[PDB]
Design a protein around this ligand. Structure first.
Ligand code: NAD
Ligand code: NAD
Ligand code: NAD
Ligand code: NAD
Ligand code: NAD
Lengths: 361, 361, 361, 361, 361
């Protein structure tokens, strides 16, 4: 089939729909791929690498959008609304329940849109988001260490300390995928680490990973209060299915933290579990409240596009191949794929997006 | 005795001569300490903490400089030349072989100046520099990870990678104190690590620390060339006694590195082992040569003043106490202290500084 | 019941149906066991040990084959066709889909034959093969190290290297049971290790076992090519259910490998994932193609009969006991056992073997 | 200076005096190197690699022996006696106290001969032998595992066992360099390990390396007897300065060992600590006594010439460079080098070799 | 709702139904809690702590028993039979199949009684017992070490030994929750450890936790006999669903053990797997049979009430909250809770307790 890969146009978005290794694999399956020049450059892939792989490098987005299947990272923007085609297959992150205009647009056009984030296993797991959660967890500590540096606004604490001197104290709220990857890094830098979770069985499992090196604590307000007050680095990594996140950290608790301490709340979209936290810019990634540094920049994985592009591809690829092979019939063979389906032929198909635009259904 | 601690005035210097725990200890020994207001604040110590410790908080530097002993972090600046006194004891980092004017100043004044960096054991070890080498080694990786982020100018590589994706490759030139601490951090973040050294016995010792997790390689041009070409993060940590550092990495080698890769040369004063590296600012910590990011900001430990102040104190303290107790006679009891002596009563005493200002002796 | 254990007669087969500990256990359950003299000697078990266990040691195979139940390791050979009886229970590895004559023989005779390799759990797992996969994985590295020795034909590389010198590079294709055990050994010898797999969730799990000590890579032709070219030791450990193995390594790739490098493809029966690999002898376990040493000897576990006999027994025993107790009714109580049933009363019962000898059904 | 490297002619000797990386380094120092064609091929180095390094590849040994300095691995053989020159510098392993004829030959010729094995530090350490001890220690386990395989003559025991089955038991007599490297490998393969030593302080140090994973036992006849009787693999790694090795294992003890168990005595030249052990061939590396497999092949490191050549070079190189630079005056600057001196201008200089050929002095 | 917490009156019982953190959490949910004075003191919780949490501290048990819901640790005793009320909710450990009188009492009264130990998941797991199994496993080793001390009656063996001296040998029968926690501690003290289990898949899993540090052995009489004879510390940790425990250790085996060796059978209620073991007192926790020390004191977790109270609460809490919120309707929403139901309105509801008092149903 013909596969197009336009360059990402969203602000600060350096990832790319397909890496060269993916392309190669696709080309060996009988398919042909068209990629816009420079599409891969923010991620570290030259057009050259794409040609070596069997890609046809196209000079414009029009040329890339004109294919039967388009594979991207982010949702289409208004600047590209006119590039879309009636019978395309669009496979990318959509987040439709947050973009009515976008939802209507796809609807008018009549294509079929499959969202990475709705492809779901019986497991109830979302295989195409995980890779991003792993990365965010790892980055949280890296960003946190930077902001604990004096020139960056923090107290001037080295996470690992040095023999004779106290190490930094990292408190992680939530021991799921993100919280677990964060703990791995903090431990690697030498910090003293505490993880809170409400699921004891998850806590038991974490003990198999860390042994007695990390403190594994049941999530209750009383212990949270004490721990948070002593933290140099607080990482929010909580997720709850039927809703937005619980505020485990009220402004009053924040007020009790040490000056120059830092909070990184990875749970930014769904609210955060920290009361004083809101999303931040990039020309201004942080702000202070009570002398405590706040970091609320989202899509953390965008800081490592080379690593992030491959991680995503490793997971999307088999789906890309199935679609290229069976086209629309794959949704009838693949239940997970069938669940990624959001829009088709002017109809809003995803039940979740329906309950949000009940009048769009 | 009376001990004074002025606030550091050098640019970007947030450390402080004595921490509150040190002060307390000093006060319990019979001594009294005077500290300039706000002297400890960049390091995270309020005047309050100093008063609780037994310190007398003085409102001006004059008041702090007027003591029989002054304890600081950096060398005196011209702005303080008039504050110095004839019979003081000055204990701080001096680096006289690089400051003639300063050397002459101390000479005129007639005090006795003891340099942290010349206090030396029979071991030939410099006990008061080590703490700073440990910190620099640990920070190098932390800074390196930041600069490998796309927005910071790097390729966009996560050091630890994610299962399925290649981890970052870190190459460390020199397996001494700095190189060893750097390896500890890189390994902690999940990177693939290679350390080069010319001392096999040091390599053998490192194996006892890391096992087979790190690649331990003999330093020869041939292997260096190959390794460096594949690095995401290159850390220079070489030191050679009788001179400046060897250029293990010529511009030609740098030219062969991947775009967006980063070099952190901790060996900045003595030259660096990297040809294209020079010191950098803070309003501009890095620059590019061949698409490769260069970081040459010195006194790395200044980024974590809270941790760095305590590490230094843990080591200087026993010397501070000996001086306060025995005053000048300590140099006659302590050989290491006797070696820290640089200037006394208008005479240049340190042989090393003499061979540099042979006409000052 | 009466249980017989003949000595294995197949070439190079030193294992034995029951170890002495098994026998003891069987005897304490009310059963009696007859074993041919010397049956256990290749595995390190003297007849003495068998008598201490409660076994009756019989002088001939006839005496051992004449029992209501016979327990062996390998399939019956033509030399024993006349020893079989109409109503026996035969429990051993059969591999009928590869032995028509054998399949017809059991059919004529009219016994019931249960194959270790078809006993299967709902899990779809084959509990009686695993023990052999674990052993093969561990041996692969052991054999590989031997063949990397100069006198054995290899390049003369020590897997662990020595501080100052590069360790050997081991590449494992497939991260399942075999590939995982191989990685454990390679890591134990100090090698640099890469594992490829197409299942990301398996890759994630492996990270919980190895941390960042092993490189965990997604199986794609592009990365495979690069990795394989740099390998000292290549281990094939791929398995795919609905068929034979994929050739992940074409002769062209093999041609690009270093002279004296070695390939051990554990996936020998089902083809191998290496193009240039074919089964080898024992009077000649290896051969060279492009200066690269090939090892294709099967039934690797036969090299450690003492360890292999016990591992198998630990798993077969509970089934042996159930059969001795309930005889044929066990297949009606045990679904896994019911699945091991291949032949009974002249009829070919196993659906898998039926689809192979569709005219035998 | 001119440096020659002849091809090694001794039987089964595949190492080479200088690797290509060494050569390169030498060439960059102002020196020129001549190497006999194919000299590096048994170690995995093509002439090509030597030319790339700056070597001049010579067609004959005569051409290589004709230089002011010759660098080899083994001692000169009678076939090369005529190639030697009056004023050469010969640097290689000599073992003169075992070769009278050779000793006389060097004497006649009048060159100066420096033996790797006599270069000694104040430490009393022999820096140029260690690399070989490390390798032998690692290989011992590798060879031992092979001989425990049934087809190789052993009991058929997998060192690591499998969950549910006992691992192999490895007993190491001597916890020095060799014994320690052996333990590292055995532990890596999963074996149960015991190390005996008479030096408690060495035992204490080993605990810092292995923790409680290895049993660390004081060397006394009583415990030795018990342990040895239960071993699958016995490794002799004892060394005593003023003499030959103690027989810690009398034939009577050997008689008590399990059939198919194996003994690898790395202490072969100095006798061995095992009574029934003698050196073996290569066309016959082992023999049996009491059903116990004996391995007594020496120069174990010769099995991995690629790894062994580099390990040796990493250590000899700085000495090779000093000699090329200062020629004979290096012995007057280098005490360790001065100690390597065995023969010069017809005189036997090495005190140790003198006390052996008291009439040659 | 109103929640009461009486002080535990059973002998040697220091735990308490709710910890202060639990209380706080309950109070924030809209509920009010009444606790008898001193109820928390044996566990380390002052009334003060309870008041800070929002508890109302009541002076008598009557006051605590008079609530709509009573939360305790142990079963009600005759001394409290008169305190119970018709429509209460009683949530605590009951063990009714062992207390007929108690069972009849609850029956008369007409309350609804929910037993911690019958709350069960589809998993068939008993979430409210696990926490106690983990603790018992950890304590077993701690108690065992104490009894191996000479003054306590044991042989005088230090589990970890010291470099040069054999470590203690610990044998664990059963590799489930208890056996696994015991192994963790024994390994932590430096002992040589063997675990036996009949489930190979459990053995495989344990290898992922311990690697090759522990010996993982299949449970068969032959190996058990040998291992037990050499043990310093034997820990019984076997559980079998449809019955009482198997005697894996007959008195005859015990007779073969070393004098001063110790047995701790955690499997005390269900019999023990050790023939010579019976429950013991506290004024006499052990006894000897054949010079072997026996420890059979039950409810091991009672020795660490501070730790044990919190572990239990972490697990019971969510159930306590559900009950307080939905009262009786929770059993209709919660299947696990519905399974904890033993008695209600004079009727015996639990099928298991019915089959024991078939005439009570
Ligand atoms: N900013 C970014 O780039 C980015 C990327 C990915 C995910 N995230 C966010 O990070 C969060 C973590 O996602 P995840 O994949 O780890 O989910 P997860 O389900 O793997 O982990 C969440 C964990 O939180 C625990 N939790 C829930 N309530 C809790 C409570 N009251 N106290 C303590 N722990 C509680 C759960 O028991 C669970 O273990 C989500 O909110 C997600 O949206 C941000
Ligand atoms: N910028 C900062 O804030 C800061 C702070 C401290 C130290 N440093 C610098 O960092 C360097 C490292 O200091 P250190 O305490 O680790 O010294 P060290 O002696 O502990 O380590 C240096 C090591 O380099 C090795 N080395 C020398 N020549 C080599 C060669 N050709 N190849 C490979 N390795 C070689 C030596 O064998 C030694 O092991 C010095 O140059 C020091 O001035 C910078
Ligand atoms: N010679 C012997 O004595 C012996 C003994 C046992 C097994 N074997 C063979 O070894 C192989 C391994 O068996 P196992 O028990 O490990 O199976 P397994 O299922 O546990 O492992 C196989 C793994 O291969 C992976 N795989 C499949 N296709 C792949 C691809 N294209 N790239 C990379 N990985 C891929 C799967 O995802 C899986 O994780 C089989 O072929 C089996 O027949 C040989
Ligand atoms: N065959 C080969 O290729 C080869 C290569 C190198 C070394 N070797 C030999 O291996 C031996 C080991 O050499 P090394 O470098 O380990 O020496 P080492 O000094 O590092 O180790 C020897 C150790 O043996 C211990 N020892 C001495 N007497 C003992 C006794 N009665 N019981 C127990 N331990 C005792 C010492 O305390 C010491 O720790 C030597 O005999 C050497 O000649 C063979
Ligand atoms: N005294 C106390 O305070 C206390 C507290 C909790 C549990 N216990 C007791 O401890 C025992 C262990 O409980 P658990 O939670 O570990 O159960 P579990 O199911 O987690 O562990 C029991 C294990 O025993 C194994 N096993 C069964 N039969 C065996 C045999 N013949 N040989 C070897 N292993 C065998 C099973 O395969 C299983 O892995 C139970 O009997 C329980 O009643 C005592």
């Amino acid at each position: 089939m013909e596969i197009g890969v336009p360059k990402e146009i969203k602000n600060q978005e350096f990832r790319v729909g397909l890496s060269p290794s993916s392309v190669r694999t696709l080309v060996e399956a009988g398919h042909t791929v068209f990629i816009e020049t420079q599409a891969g450059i923010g991620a570290g892939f030259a057009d050259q690498d794409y040609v070596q792989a069997g890609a046809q490098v196209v000079p414009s987005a029009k040329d890339a959008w004109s294919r039967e299947m388009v594979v991207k990272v982010k949702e289409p923007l208004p600047a590209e609304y006119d590039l879309m085609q009636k019978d395309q297959l669009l496979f990318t992150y959509l987040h439709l329940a947050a973009a009515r205009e976008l939802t209507e647009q796809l609807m008018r056009v009549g294509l079929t849109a499959i969202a990475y984030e709705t492809v779901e296993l019986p497991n109830r797991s979302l295989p195409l988001l995980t890779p991003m959660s792993i990365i965010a967890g790892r980055l949280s500590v890296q960003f946190g260490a930077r902001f604990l540096e004096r020139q960056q606004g923090g107290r001037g604490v080295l996470l690992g300390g040095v023999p004779g001197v106290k190490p930094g104290k990292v408190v992680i709220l939530g021991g799921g995928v993100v919280g677990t990857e964060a703990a791995k890094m903090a431990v690697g830098l030498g910090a003293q680490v505490q993880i809170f979770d409400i699921n004891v069985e998850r806590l038991s499992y974490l003990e198999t990973l860390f042994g007695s090196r990390v403190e594994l604590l049941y999530s209750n307000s009383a212990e949270i209060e004490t721990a948070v007050a002593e933290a140099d680095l607080l990482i929010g990594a909580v997720l709850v299915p039927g809703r937005r996140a619980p505020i485990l950290v009220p402004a009053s608790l924040v007020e009790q933290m040490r000056t120059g301490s830092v909070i990184v709340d990875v749970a930014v979209d769904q609210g955060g579990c920290v009361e004083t936290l809101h999303p931040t810019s990039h020309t201004q990634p942080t702000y202070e409240v009570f002398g405590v540094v706040h970091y609320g920049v989202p899509n953390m994985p965008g800081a490592v596009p080379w690593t992030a592009t491959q991680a995503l591809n490793n997971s999307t690829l088999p789906y890309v191949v199935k679609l290229a092979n069976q086209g629309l019939k794959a949704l009838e063979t693949d239940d997970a794929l069938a669940k990624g389906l959001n829009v088709q032929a002017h109809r809003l198909v995803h039940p979740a997006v329906q309950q949000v635009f009940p009048d769009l259904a």
